[PDB]
């Protein structure tokens, strides 16, 4: 009579792990920590035999977030330890921001006590899985790529039909480009080329050859037109170059420091 279909099906799942136990250890896995129920290794999540294939399949999907989270966390540390362009850091920072948001999100759902089923869980976390998938793919080979390269790809993604893609591509771009802006300012107001790692089109000319090593005729600044980004019209890229070059000329050789300053 009053018995529900789940109650009727229960006798056949008596040897399996109940939903509560799953839910209790899933959140730990979602944050890429490990547990006795889900012996999560440095890479793989061991899935015990007491989880039926139906549930295993759903958990493969749910746990994707933990796996993606783990991967992103690892590269964040990889980069934290390296001396890299601040624009790469801008991306790293954004990754960390996303991971922090993820964390809050997961903890909210879990601590709310409103997740009573994996299906509900999956549906709620689904968007975050995607967001992580996006970062995970955008950060592939991050270390092999230059800051400009990412800005270019981001510009492409900023027009992508998917709205989450646009939000992420836009935000990542904004974070990085704001430092490009800073590089440009350093050049424009200080004549400064610093920590460019070759990502800035204006470079120190270190290719000396005896004649003029004292920079009497030449001021050691390169204008690499081929490295000028899409967002800087050629005319300005050159003008920018000449502004800083002039700054240097003036400050270094004419010594009109009070004015210059």
């Amino acid at each position: 009579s009053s018995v529900t279909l789940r109650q009727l099906s229960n006798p056949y799942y008596v040897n399996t792990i109940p939903e509560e136990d799953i839910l209790k250890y899933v959140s730990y896995t979602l944050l890429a920590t490990t547990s006795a129920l889900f012996p999560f290794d440095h890479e793989q999540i061991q899935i015990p035999s007491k989880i039926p294939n139906f549930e295993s399949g759903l958990l493969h999907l749910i746990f994707e977030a933990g796996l993606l989270y783990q991967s992103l966390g690892y590269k964040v540390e990889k980069f934290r330890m390296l001396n890299i362009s601040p624009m790469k850091k801008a991306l790293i920072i954004e990754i960390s921001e996303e991971l922090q948001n993820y964390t809050a999100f997961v903890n909210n759902l879990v601590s709310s006590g409103t997740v009573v089923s994996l299906k509900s869980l999956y549906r709620e976390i689904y968007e975050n899985i995607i967001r992580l998938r996006i970062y995970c793919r955008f950060t592939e080979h991050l270390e092999e790529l230059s800051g400009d390269t990412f800005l270019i790809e981001l510009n492409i993604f900023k027009s992508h039909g998917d709205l989450t893609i646009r939000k992420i591509a836009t935000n990542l771009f904004n974070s990085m480009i704001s430092l490009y802006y800073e590089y440009l300012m350093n050049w424009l107001t200080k004549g400064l080329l610093r920590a460019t790692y070759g990502e800035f089109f204006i470079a120190e000319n270190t290719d000396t050859n005896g004649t003029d090593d004292d920079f009497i005729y030449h001021i050691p600044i390169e204008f690499n037109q081929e490295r000028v980004p899409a967002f800087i019209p050629k005319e300005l890229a050159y003008k920018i170059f000449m502004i800083g070059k002039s700054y240097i000329f003036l400050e270094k050789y004419c010594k009109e420091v009070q004015w210059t300053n």
Partner: protein, 385 residues
Amino acid sequence: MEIKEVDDRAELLRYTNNIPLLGKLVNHQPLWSTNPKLKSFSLEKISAPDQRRVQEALVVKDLLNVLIGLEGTYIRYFNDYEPSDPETPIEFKIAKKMDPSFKTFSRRIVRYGKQYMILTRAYEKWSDTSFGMVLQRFAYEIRRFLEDVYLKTLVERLERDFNKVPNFSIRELEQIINETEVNKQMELLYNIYEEIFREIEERRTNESSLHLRLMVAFDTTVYPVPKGGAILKIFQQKILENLGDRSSVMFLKKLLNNISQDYCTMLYEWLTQGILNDPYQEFMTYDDLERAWDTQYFIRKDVLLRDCDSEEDKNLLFKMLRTGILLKVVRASLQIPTIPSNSSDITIQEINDFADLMEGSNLELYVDKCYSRANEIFLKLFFQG
């Protein structure tokens, strides 16, 4: 039920070189057919009246999993299903020992599960940059549908009732699927998928304007993907197919209204600013030069909004091109990124609704206004400047 010892492992796929940007980046549970994990149950043991209700409970549990693309206890993936190769056909085996009333309901319900898996897979594929922009937005809309409606219903209404309703039955399950019209929406999306798909398979398989021309070529390349106007036309056709069904067309219109926003935005800027930015090649036109003044123009016949086998559409097409070209020249001459609203006193409103623009001779008047603005501004500068 007894448990077989199977060591499953969840892991990230190691290679993503051929994985769509939004596709799954993890492995999958082994199939029943290779690693059963549970001991088989014969069904017949519980087939008697008053045992049958349990069999039903077990069947419903399976359907709930089937509807999200998972196999169940008595419903198994098709033998040649290959989860590691997402081209694989989707089909299911129903335990033959199942009560025939259930076997019947199951086929009716599993069908939605098939659409689910396909649509899910399709939007993931469509995230690739090789796909058109409008299609990418469509893929987005599908994904949202599934989260907003499909699964919302499944999770909050149906699983919940399985767990809590004493008289829930497979009969109700079918009723719900239909009464909420979720299935209808699934079918409509599905049918769109099939139409697109078919069109793609065909794509994979296969002077009257001279007096008004400049250095322009007609690009007849047939793309593997029905980008731009080609997708938009499908939607128009689907509306025609659904005429008389108000719910269906409203649904379809909402989709069109959403997917077309970027296309019409791109169009707007071309027509009011002369600014065309089309990294996904959706637009009806493109030019050369990605000194550099010898601009060649191209007409992308395959993504046009109108086929232009009529005089009116040909005339419209060219006026539209000229509009944008005149504006481009002005921007180039003035070395301005944009032409302000404070120039010729013509206000051109944004396209808010693509379909509304396509409906009636709205393109003709909209474009005439756009054209006129381009023309007046152009003339002012050329004559007086």
